[PDB]
CSV table of N, CA, C and O in Angstrom, one decimal:
chain,number,residue,atom,x,y,z
K,1,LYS,N,61.8,-76.8,-44.4
K,1,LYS,CA,61.5,-77.9,-45.4
K,1,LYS,C,60.0,-78.0,-45.5
K,1,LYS,O,59.2,-77.4,-44.7
K,2,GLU,N,59.5,-78.8,-46.5
K,2,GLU,CA,58.1,-78.9,-46.8
K,2,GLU,C,57.6,-80.2,-46.2
K,2,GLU,O,58.3,-81.2,-46.2
K,3,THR,N,56.3,-80.2,-45.7
K,3,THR,CA,55.7,-81.5,-45.3
K,3,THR,C,55.5,-82.3,-46.6
K,3,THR,O,55.3,-81.7,-47.7
K,4,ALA,N,55.4,-83.6,-46.5
K,4,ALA,CA,55.1,-84.4,-47.7
K,4,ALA,C,53.8,-84.1,-48.3
K,4,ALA,O,53.7,-84.0,-49.5
K,5,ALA,N,52.8,-83.8,-47.5
K,5,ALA,CA,51.4,-83.4,-48.0
K,5,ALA,C,51.5,-82.1,-48.8
K,5,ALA,O,50.8,-82.0,-49.8
K,6,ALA,N,52.2,-81.1,-48.3
K,6,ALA,CA,52.3,-79.8,-48.9
K,6,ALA,C,53.0,-79.9,-50.2
K,6,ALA,O,52.7,-79.2,-51.2
K,7,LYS,N,54.0,-80.7,-50.2
K,7,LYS,CA,54.8,-80.9,-51.4
K,7,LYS,C,53.9,-81.5,-52.5
K,7,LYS,O,53.9,-81.1,-53.7
K,8,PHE,N,53.0,-82.5,-52.1
K,8,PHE,CA,52.1,-83.1,-53.1
K,8,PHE,C,51.2,-82.0,-53.6
K,8,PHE,O,51.0,-81.9,-54.9
K,9,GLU,N,50.6,-81.2,-52.8
K,9,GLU,CA,49.8,-80.1,-53.2
K,9,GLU,C,50.5,-79.1,-54.2
K,9,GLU,O,49.9,-78.8,-55.3
K,10,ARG,N,51.7,-78.7,-53.8
K,10,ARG,CA,52.4,-77.8,-54.7
K,10,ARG,C,52.7,-78.4,-56.1
K,10,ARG,O,52.6,-77.8,-57.1
K,11,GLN,N,53.1,-79.7,-56.1
K,11,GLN,CA,53.5,-80.4,-57.4
K,11,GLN,C,52.3,-80.8,-58.2
K,11,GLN,O,52.4,-80.8,-59.4
K,12,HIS,N,51.2,-81.1,-57.6
K,12,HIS,CA,50.2,-81.9,-58.3
K,12,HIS,C,48.8,-81.3,-58.3
K,12,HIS,O,47.9,-81.9,-59.1
K,13,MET,N,48.5,-80.3,-57.5
K,13,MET,CA,47.1,-79.8,-57.5
K,13,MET,C,46.9,-78.5,-58.3
K,13,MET,O,47.6,-77.5,-58.1
K,14,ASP,N,45.9,-78.6,-59.2
K,14,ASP,CA,45.5,-77.3,-59.9
K,14,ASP,C,44.0,-77.3,-60.0
K,14,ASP,O,43.4,-77.5,-61.0
K,15,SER,N,43.3,-76.9,-58.9
K,15,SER,CA,41.8,-76.9,-58.8
K,15,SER,C,41.3,-75.6,-59.5
K,15,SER,O,40.1,-75.4,-59.5
K,16,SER,N,42.2,-74.7,-59.9
K,16,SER,CA,41.7,-73.4,-60.4
K,16,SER,C,41.3,-73.4,-61.9
K,16,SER,O,40.7,-72.5,-62.3
K,17,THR,N,41.5,-74.5,-62.6
K,17,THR,CA,41.1,-74.7,-63.9
K,17,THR,C,40.5,-76.1,-64.1
K,17,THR,O,40.9,-77.0,-63.4
K,18,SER,N,39.6,-76.2,-65.1
K,18,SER,CA,39.0,-77.5,-65.3
K,18,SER,C,39.9,-78.4,-66.3
K,18,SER,O,39.7,-79.6,-66.4
K,19,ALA,N,40.9,-77.7,-66.9
K,19,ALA,CA,41.8,-78.4,-67.8
K,19,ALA,C,42.9,-77.5,-68.2
K,19,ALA,O,42.8,-76.3,-68.0
K,20,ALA,N,44.0,-78.0,-68.9
K,20,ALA,CA,45.0,-77.1,-69.3
K,20,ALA,C,44.5,-76.1,-70.4
K,20,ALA,O,43.8,-76.5,-71.3
K,21,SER,N,44.8,-74.8,-70.3
K,21,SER,CA,44.2,-73.8,-71.1
K,21,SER,C,44.9,-73.6,-72.4
K,21,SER,O,44.3,-73.1,-73.4
K,22,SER,N,46.2,-73.9,-72.5
K,22,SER,CA,47.0,-73.8,-73.7
K,22,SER,C,48.1,-74.8,-73.8
K,22,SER,O,48.4,-75.4,-72.8
K,23,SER,N,48.8,-74.8,-74.9
K,23,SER,CA,50.0,-75.7,-75.0
K,23,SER,C,51.1,-75.2,-74.2
K,23,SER,O,52.1,-75.9,-74.0
K,24,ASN,N,51.0,-73.9,-73.7
K,24,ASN,CA,52.0,-73.4,-72.8
K,24,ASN,C,51.7,-73.6,-71.3
K,24,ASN,O,52.5,-73.2,-70.4
K,25,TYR,N,50.6,-74.3,-71.0
K,25,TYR,CA,50.2,-74.5,-69.6
K,25,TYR,C,51.3,-75.1,-68.8
K,25,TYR,O,51.6,-74.6,-67.7
K,26,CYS,N,52.0,-76.1,-69.3
K,26,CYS,CA,53.1,-76.8,-68.5
K,26,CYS,C,54.3,-75.9,-68.3
K,26,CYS,O,54.9,-75.9,-67.3
K,27,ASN,N,54.7,-75.2,-69.4
K,27,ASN,CA,55.8,-74.3,-69.2
K,27,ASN,C,55.5,-73.3,-68.1
K,27,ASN,O,56.4,-73.0,-67.3
K,28,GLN,N,54.3,-72.8,-68.0
K,28,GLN,CA,54.0,-71.8,-67.0
K,28,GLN,C,53.9,-72.4,-65.6
K,28,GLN,O,54.4,-71.9,-64.7
K,29,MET,N,53.2,-73.6,-65.5
K,29,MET,CA,53.0,-74.2,-64.2
K,29,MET,C,54.2,-74.8,-63.6
K,29,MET,O,54.4,-74.8,-62.4
K,30,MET,N,55.1,-75.4,-64.4
K,30,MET,CA,56.3,-76.1,-63.9
K,30,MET,C,57.2,-75.0,-63.2
K,30,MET,O,57.8,-75.2,-62.2
K,31,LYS,N,57.2,-73.8,-63.9
K,31,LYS,CA,57.9,-72.7,-63.3
K,31,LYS,C,57.3,-72.1,-62.1
K,31,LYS,O,58.0,-72.0,-61.0
K,32,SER,N,56.1,-71.8,-62.1
K,32,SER,CA,55.4,-71.1,-60.9
K,32,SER,C,55.2,-72.1,-59.8
K,32,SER,O,55.0,-71.6,-58.6
K,33,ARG,N,55.3,-73.4,-60.0
K,33,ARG,CA,55.2,-74.3,-58.9
K,33,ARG,C,56.6,-74.7,-58.4
K,33,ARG,O,56.7,-75.6,-57.6
K,34,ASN,N,57.6,-74.0,-58.8
K,34,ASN,CA,59.0,-74.1,-58.4
K,34,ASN,C,59.6,-75.5,-58.8
K,34,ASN,O,60.4,-76.0,-58.0
K,35,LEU,N,59.2,-76.0,-59.9
K,35,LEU,CA,59.7,-77.3,-60.3
K,35,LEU,C,60.8,-77.2,-61.4
K,35,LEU,O,61.3,-78.2,-61.9
K,36,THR,N,61.3,-76.0,-61.6
K,36,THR,CA,62.4,-75.7,-62.6
K,36,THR,C,63.5,-74.9,-61.9
K,36,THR,O,64.4,-74.4,-62.6
K,37,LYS,N,63.5,-74.9,-60.6
K,37,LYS,CA,64.5,-74.1,-59.9
K,37,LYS,C,65.9,-74.6,-60.0
K,37,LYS,O,66.8,-73.9,-60.7
K,38,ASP,N,66.2,-75.7,-59.4
K,38,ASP,CA,67.6,-76.3,-59.4
K,38,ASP,C,67.9,-77.1,-60.7
K,38,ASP,O,69.0,-77.2,-61.1
K,39,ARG,N,66.8,-77.6,-61.3
K,39,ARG,CA,66.9,-78.3,-62.5
K,39,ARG,C,65.5,-78.5,-63.1
K,39,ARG,O,64.5,-78.0,-62.5
K,40,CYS,N,65.4,-79.1,-64.3
K,40,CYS,CA,64.0,-79.3,-64.9
K,40,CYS,C,63.6,-80.6,-64.3
K,40,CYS,O,64.2,-81.7,-64.6
K,41,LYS,N,62.5,-80.6,-63.6
K,41,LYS,CA,61.9,-81.9,-63.2
K,41,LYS,C,61.3,-82.5,-64.5
K,41,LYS,O,60.6,-81.8,-65.3
K,42,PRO,N,61.7,-83.7,-64.8
K,42,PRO,CA,61.5,-84.3,-66.2
K,42,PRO,C,60.0,-84.6,-66.5
K,42,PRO,O,59.6,-84.4,-67.6
K,43,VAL,N,59.3,-85.1,-65.5
K,43,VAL,CA,57.9,-85.5,-65.6
K,43,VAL,C,57.1,-85.1,-64.4
K,43,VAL,O,57.5,-85.2,-63.3
K,44,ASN,N,55.9,-84.6,-64.7
K,44,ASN,CA,55.0,-84.1,-63.6
K,44,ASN,C,53.5,-84.0,-64.0
K,44,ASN,O,53.3,-83.5,-65.1
K,45,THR,N,52.6,-84.4,-63.1
K,45,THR,CA,51.2,-84.4,-63.5
K,45,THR,C,50.5,-83.4,-62.6
K,45,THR,O,50.7,-83.4,-61.4
K,46,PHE,N,49.6,-82.6,-63.1
K,46,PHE,CA,48.7,-81.8,-62.4
K,46,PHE,C,47.3,-82.3,-62.4
K,46,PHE,O,46.8,-82.8,-63.5
K,47,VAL,N,46.5,-82.2,-61.3
K,47,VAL,CA,45.1,-82.7,-61.3
K,47,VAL,C,44.2,-81.6,-61.2
K,47,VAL,O,44.3,-80.8,-60.2
K,48,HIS,N,43.2,-81.5,-62.1
K,48,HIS,CA,42.3,-80.4,-62.1
K,48,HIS,C,41.0,-80.8,-61.4
K,48,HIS,O,40.0,-80.9,-62.1
K,49,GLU,N,41.1,-81.1,-60.1
K,49,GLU,CA,39.8,-81.4,-59.4
K,49,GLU,C,40.0,-80.8,-58.0
K,49,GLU,O,41.1,-80.3,-57.7
K,50,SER,N,39.0,-80.7,-57.2
K,50,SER,CA,39.1,-80.1,-55.9
K,50,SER,C,40.1,-80.8,-55.1
K,50,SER,O,40.3,-82.0,-55.3
K,51,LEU,N,40.7,-80.1,-54.1
K,51,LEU,CA,41.6,-80.8,-53.2
K,51,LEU,C,40.9,-81.9,-52.4
K,51,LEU,O,41.4,-83.0,-52.2
K,52,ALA,N,39.6,-81.6,-52.1
K,52,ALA,CA,38.8,-82.6,-51.4
K,52,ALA,C,38.7,-83.9,-52.2
K,52,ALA,O,38.8,-85.0,-51.7
K,53,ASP,N,38.4,-83.8,-53.5
K,53,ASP,CA,38.2,-85.0,-54.3
K,53,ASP,C,39.5,-85.8,-54.4
K,53,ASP,O,39.5,-87.0,-54.5
K,54,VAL,N,40.7,-85.1,-54.4
K,54,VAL,CA,41.9,-85.8,-54.6
K,54,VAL,C,42.3,-86.4,-53.2
K,54,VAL,O,42.7,-87.6,-53.2
K,55,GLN,N,42.1,-85.7,-52.1
K,55,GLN,CA,42.3,-86.4,-50.8
K,55,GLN,C,41.4,-87.6,-50.6
K,55,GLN,O,41.9,-88.6,-50.0
K,56,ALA,N,40.2,-87.5,-51.2
K,56,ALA,CA,39.3,-88.6,-51.0
K,56,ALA,C,39.8,-89.9,-51.6
K,56,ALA,O,39.4,-91.0,-51.3
K,57,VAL,N,40.8,-89.8,-52.6
K,57,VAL,CA,41.3,-91.0,-53.2
K,57,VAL,C,41.9,-91.9,-52.2
K,57,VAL,O,41.9,-93.2,-52.4
K,58,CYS,N,42.5,-91.4,-51.1
K,58,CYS,CA,43.1,-92.2,-50.1
K,58,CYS,C,42.1,-93.2,-49.4
K,58,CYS,O,42.6,-94.0,-48.6
K,59,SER,N,40.8,-93.0,-49.7
K,59,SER,CA,39.8,-93.9,-49.2
K,59,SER,C,39.2,-94.8,-50.2
K,59,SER,O,38.2,-95.4,-50.0
K,60,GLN,N,39.8,-94.7,-51.4
K,60,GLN,CA,39.2,-95.5,-52.6
K,60,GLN,C,40.0,-96.8,-52.8
K,60,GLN,O,40.2,-97.6,-51.9
K,61,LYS,N,40.3,-97.1,-54.1
K,61,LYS,CA,40.7,-98.5,-54.3
K,61,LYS,C,42.2,-98.7,-54.0
K,61,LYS,O,43.1,-98.2,-54.7
K,62,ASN,N,42.4,-99.5,-52.9
K,62,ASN,CA,43.8,-99.8,-52.5
K,62,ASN,C,44.5,-100.7,-53.6
K,62,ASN,O,44.0,-101.8,-53.9
K,63,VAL,N,45.6,-100.2,-54.1
K,63,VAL,CA,46.4,-101.0,-55.1
K,63,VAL,C,47.8,-100.9,-54.8
K,63,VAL,O,48.3,-100.0,-54.0
K,64,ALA,N,48.6,-101.7,-55.4
K,64,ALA,CA,50.1,-101.6,-55.2
K,64,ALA,C,50.7,-100.4,-55.9
K,64,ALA,O,50.2,-99.9,-57.0
K,65,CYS,N,51.7,-99.8,-55.3
K,65,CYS,CA,52.5,-98.8,-55.9
K,65,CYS,C,53.4,-99.4,-56.9
K,65,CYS,O,53.7,-100.6,-56.7
K,66,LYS,N,54.0,-98.7,-57.8
K,66,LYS,CA,54.9,-99.2,-58.8
K,66,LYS,C,56.2,-99.9,-58.2
K,66,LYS,O,56.7,-100.8,-58.7
K,67,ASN,N,56.6,-99.4,-57.0
K,67,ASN,CA,57.7,-100.0,-56.3
K,67,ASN,C,57.4,-101.1,-55.4
K,67,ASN,O,58.2,-101.6,-54.6
K,68,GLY,N,56.1,-101.5,-55.4
K,68,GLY,CA,55.6,-102.6,-54.5
K,68,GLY,C,55.1,-102.2,-53.2
K,68,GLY,O,54.6,-103.1,-52.5
K,69,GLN,N,55.2,-100.9,-52.8
K,69,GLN,CA,54.5,-100.5,-51.5
K,69,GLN,C,53.0,-100.7,-51.5
K,69,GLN,O,52.4,-100.8,-52.6
K,70,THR,N,52.4,-100.9,-50.4
K,70,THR,CA,51.0,-101.2,-50.3
K,70,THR,C,50.1,-100.1,-50.0
K,70,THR,O,48.9,-100.2,-49.9
K,71,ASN,N,50.6,-98.8,-50.0
K,71,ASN,CA,49.8,-97.7,-49.6
K,71,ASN,C,49.4,-96.8,-50.8
K,71,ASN,O,49.4,-95.6,-50.6
K,72,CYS,N,49.1,-97.4,-51.9
K,72,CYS,CA,48.6,-96.6,-53.1
K,72,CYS,C,47.1,-96.9,-53.3
K,72,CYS,O,46.6,-97.9,-52.9
K,73,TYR,N,46.5,-95.9,-53.9
K,73,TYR,CA,45.0,-95.8,-54.0
K,73,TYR,C,44.7,-95.3,-55.4
K,73,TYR,O,45.2,-94.3,-55.9
K,74,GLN,N,43.8,-96.0,-56.1
K,74,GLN,CA,43.3,-95.6,-57.4
K,74,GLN,C,42.0,-95.0,-57.4
K,74,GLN,O,41.1,-95.5,-56.7
K,75,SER,N,41.8,-93.8,-58.0
K,75,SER,CA,40.5,-93.2,-58.0
K,75,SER,C,39.5,-94.0,-58.6
K,75,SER,O,39.7,-94.7,-59.7
K,76,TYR,N,38.3,-94.1,-58.0
K,76,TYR,CA,37.2,-94.9,-58.6
K,76,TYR,C,36.7,-94.2,-59.9
K,76,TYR,O,36.2,-94.9,-60.8
K,77,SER,N,36.9,-92.9,-60.0
K,77,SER,CA,36.4,-92.2,-61.2
K,77,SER,C,37.6,-91.7,-61.9
K,77,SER,O,38.7,-91.7,-61.5
K,78,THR,N,37.4,-91.2,-63.2
K,78,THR,CA,38.4,-90.5,-63.9
K,78,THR,C,38.4,-89.1,-63.5
K,78,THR,O,37.4,-88.5,-63.1
K,79,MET,N,39.5,-88.4,-63.6
K,79,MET,CA,39.7,-87.0,-63.2
K,79,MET,C,40.4,-86.3,-64.4
K,79,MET,O,41.2,-86.8,-65.1
K,80,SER,N,40.1,-85.0,-64.5
K,80,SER,CA,40.8,-84.1,-65.4
K,80,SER,C,42.3,-83.9,-65.0
K,80,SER,O,42.6,-83.4,-63.9
K,81,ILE,N,43.2,-84.3,-65.8
K,81,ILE,CA,44.6,-84.2,-65.5
K,81,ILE,C,45.4,-83.6,-66.6
K,81,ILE,O,45.0,-83.7,-67.8
K,82,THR,N,46.6,-83.1,-66.3
K,82,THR,CA,47.6,-82.7,-67.3
K,82,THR,C,48.9,-83.3,-67.1
K,82,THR,O,49.5,-83.1,-66.0
K,83,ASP,N,49.5,-84.0,-68.1
K,83,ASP,CA,50.8,-84.5,-67.9
K,83,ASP,C,51.8,-83.5,-68.5
K,83,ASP,O,51.6,-83.0,-69.6
K,84,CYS,N,52.8,-83.2,-67.7
K,84,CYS,CA,53.9,-82.3,-68.3
K,84,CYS,C,55.2,-83.1,-68.4
K,84,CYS,O,55.6,-83.8,-67.5
K,85,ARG,N,55.8,-83.1,-69.6
K,85,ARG,CA,57.0,-83.8,-69.8
K,85,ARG,C,58.0,-83.0,-70.5
K,85,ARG,O,57.7,-82.3,-71.5
K,86,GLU,N,59.3,-83.0,-70.1
K,86,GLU,CA,60.3,-82.3,-70.8
K,86,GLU,C,60.4,-82.7,-72.3
K,86,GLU,O,60.3,-83.9,-72.6
K,87,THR,N,60.7,-81.7,-73.1
K,87,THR,CA,60.8,-82.0,-74.5
K,87,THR,C,62.2,-81.7,-75.0
K,87,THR,O,63.0,-81.1,-74.3
K,88,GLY,N,62.5,-82.2,-76.2
K,88,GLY,CA,63.9,-82.2,-76.7
K,88,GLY,C,64.6,-80.8,-76.7
K,88,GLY,O,65.8,-80.8,-76.5
K,89,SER,N,63.9,-79.7,-76.9
K,89,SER,CA,64.4,-78.4,-76.9
K,89,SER,C,64.8,-77.9,-75.4
K,89,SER,O,65.3,-76.8,-75.3
K,90,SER,N,64.4,-78.7,-74.4
K,90,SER,CA,64.6,-78.3,-73.0
K,90,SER,C,66.0,-78.5,-72.6
K,90,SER,O,66.6,-79.5,-72.9
K,91,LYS,N,66.5,-77.5,-71.8
K,91,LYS,CA,67.9,-77.6,-71.3
K,91,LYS,C,68.0,-76.6,-70.2
K,91,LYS,O,67.8,-75.3,-70.4
K,92,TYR,N,68.2,-77.0,-68.9
K,92,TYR,CA,68.3,-76.1,-67.8
K,92,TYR,C,69.4,-75.1,-68.0
K,92,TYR,O,70.5,-75.4,-68.5
K,93,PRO,N,69.1,-73.8,-67.7
K,93,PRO,CA,67.9,-73.3,-67.0
K,93,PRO,C,66.7,-72.9,-67.9
K,93,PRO,O,65.8,-72.3,-67.4
K,94,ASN,N,66.7,-73.3,-69.2
K,94,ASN,CA,65.6,-73.0,-70.0
K,94,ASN,C,64.7,-74.2,-70.2
K,94,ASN,O,64.8,-74.9,-71.3
K,95,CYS,N,63.9,-74.6,-69.2
K,95,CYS,CA,63.1,-75.8,-69.3
K,95,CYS,C,61.9,-75.6,-70.3
K,95,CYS,O,61.3,-74.5,-70.3
K,96,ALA,N,61.6,-76.7,-71.0
K,96,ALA,CA,60.6,-76.6,-72.0
K,96,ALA,C,59.7,-77.9,-71.9
K,96,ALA,O,60.3,-79.0,-71.8
K,97,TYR,N,58.4,-77.8,-71.8
K,97,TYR,CA,57.5,-78.9,-71.6
K,97,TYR,C,56.4,-79.1,-72.6
K,97,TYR,O,55.9,-78.2,-73.2
K,98,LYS,N,56.1,-80.4,-72.9
K,98,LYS,CA,54.9,-80.7,-73.7
K,98,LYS,C,53.7,-80.9,-72.7
K,98,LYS,O,53.9,-81.5,-71.6
K,99,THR,N,52.6,-80.3,-73.0
K,99,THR,CA,51.4,-80.4,-72.2
K,99,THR,C,50.4,-81.4,-72.8
K,99,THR,O,50.1,-81.3,-74.0
K,100,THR,N,50.1,-82.4,-72.1
K,100,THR,CA,49.1,-83.4,-72.6
K,100,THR,C,47.9,-83.5,-71.6
K,100,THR,O,48.1,-84.0,-70.5
K,101,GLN,N,46.8,-83.1,-72.1
K,101,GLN,CA,45.5,-83.1,-71.3
K,101,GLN,C,44.9,-84.5,-71.4
K,101,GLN,O,45.0,-85.1,-72.5
K,102,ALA,N,44.2,-85.0,-70.4
K,102,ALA,CA,43.6,-86.3,-70.4
K,102,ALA,C,42.6,-86.4,-69.3
K,102,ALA,O,42.6,-85.6,-68.4
K,103,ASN,N,41.8,-87.5,-69.4
K,103,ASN,CA,40.8,-87.7,-68.3
K,103,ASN,C,41.0,-89.2,-67.9
K,103,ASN,O,40.7,-90.1,-68.7
K,104,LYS,N,41.6,-89.3,-66.7
K,104,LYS,CA,42.0,-90.7,-66.3
K,104,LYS,C,41.9,-90.9,-64.8
K,104,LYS,O,41.7,-89.9,-64.0
K,105,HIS,N,42.0,-92.1,-64.4
K,105,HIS,CA,42.1,-92.4,-63.0
K,105,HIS,C,43.4,-92.0,-62.5
K,105,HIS,O,44.4,-92.2,-63.3
K,106,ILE,N,43.6,-91.6,-61.3
K,106,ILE,CA,44.9,-91.2,-60.7
K,106,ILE,C,45.2,-92.3,-59.7
K,106,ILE,O,44.3,-92.8,-59.1
K,107,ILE,N,46.5,-92.5,-59.5
K,107,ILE,CA,47.0,-93.4,-58.4
K,107,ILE,C,48.0,-92.6,-57.6
K,107,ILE,O,49.0,-92.1,-58.1
K,108,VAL,N,47.7,-92.5,-56.3
K,108,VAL,CA,48.5,-91.8,-55.4
K,108,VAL,C,48.9,-92.6,-54.2
K,108,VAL,O,48.2,-93.6,-53.9
K,109,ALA,N,50.0,-92.3,-53.5
K,109,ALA,CA,50.4,-93.0,-52.3
K,109,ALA,C,50.0,-92.1,-51.2
K,109,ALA,O,50.2,-90.9,-51.3
K,110,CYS,N,49.5,-92.7,-50.1
K,110,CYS,CA,49.0,-91.8,-49.0
K,110,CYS,C,49.7,-92.2,-47.7
K,110,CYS,O,50.2,-93.3,-47.5
K,111,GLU,N,49.8,-91.2,-46.8
K,111,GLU,CA,50.5,-91.4,-45.5
K,111,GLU,C,50.0,-90.4,-44.5
K,111,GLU,O,49.4,-89.4,-44.8
K,112,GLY,N,50.1,-90.8,-43.2
K,112,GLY,CA,49.9,-89.8,-42.1
K,112,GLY,C,48.6,-89.9,-41.5
K,112,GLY,O,47.7,-90.7,-41.7
K,113,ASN,N,48.4,-88.9,-40.6
K,113,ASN,CA,47.1,-88.7,-39.9
K,113,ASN,C,46.9,-87.2,-39.8
K,113,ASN,O,47.6,-86.6,-39.0
K,114,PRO,N,46.0,-86.7,-40.6
K,114,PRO,CA,45.1,-87.3,-41.6
K,114,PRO,C,45.9,-88.0,-42.7
K,114,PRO,O,47.0,-87.6,-43.1
K,115,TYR,N,45.2,-89.1,-43.2
K,115,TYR,CA,45.8,-89.9,-44.3
K,115,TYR,C,45.5,-89.2,-45.6
K,115,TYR,O,44.4,-89.2,-46.0
K,116,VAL,N,46.6,-88.6,-46.2
K,116,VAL,CA,46.4,-87.8,-47.3
K,116,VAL,C,47.5,-88.1,-48.4
K,116,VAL,O,48.5,-88.8,-48.1
K,117,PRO,N,47.3,-87.6,-49.7
K,117,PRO,CA,48.3,-88.0,-50.7
K,117,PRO,C,49.7,-87.4,-50.4
K,117,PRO,O,49.7,-86.2,-50.1
K,118,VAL,N,50.7,-88.2,-50.6
K,118,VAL,CA,52.1,-87.7,-50.5
K,118,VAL,C,53.0,-88.0,-51.7
K,118,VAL,O,54.2,-87.7,-51.7
K,119,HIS,N,52.4,-88.6,-52.8
K,119,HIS,CA,53.2,-89.0,-54.0
K,119,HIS,C,52.2,-89.3,-55.1
K,119,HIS,O,51.2,-89.9,-54.9
K,120,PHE,N,52.5,-88.8,-56.3
K,120,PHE,CA,51.7,-89.2,-57.5
K,120,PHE,C,52.3,-90.3,-58.2
K,120,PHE,O,53.4,-90.2,-58.7
K,121,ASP,N,51.7,-91.5,-58.2
K,121,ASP,CA,52.3,-92.7,-58.7
K,121,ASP,C,52.1,-92.9,-60.2
K,121,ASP,O,53.1,-93.2,-60.9
K,122,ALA,N,50.9,-92.6,-60.7
K,122,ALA,CA,50.6,-92.8,-62.1
K,122,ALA,C,49.1,-92.5,-62.4
K,122,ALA,O,48.4,-92.1,-61.5
K,123,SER,N,48.7,-92.5,-63.6
K,123,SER,CA,47.4,-92.3,-64.0
K,123,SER,C,47.0,-93.4,-65.0
K,123,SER,O,47.9,-93.9,-65.7
K,124,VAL,N,45.8,-93.9,-65.0
K,124,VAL,CA,45.4,-94.9,-65.9
K,124,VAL,C,44.1,-94.5,-66.6
K,124,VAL,O,43.0,-94.3,-66.0
């Protein structure tokens, strides 16, 4: 099985580009990050910043998570991100996604020692 931290990295980190490179970015990334294996994961966000900058968010603005948990943190700065969302033509096993690039604050939930991101809650 995957550690919670490693799963966050697999699902949410893309430090290799500064932004989504094409409208097919999400189709390519959801596949290669193994998010279309058993089914199409409906919604997923990738963050185009260094792993260090994303981990640092766990020391930034403490805010509530959407479910009311107290261990969420909002980035003080905006970050380059890409929202991937299933589109009408999508149907497992042929997953299809819309790519939406944006620059926003991210909100993540953190856990553990070291205290690192384990869930992507939202972006604002």
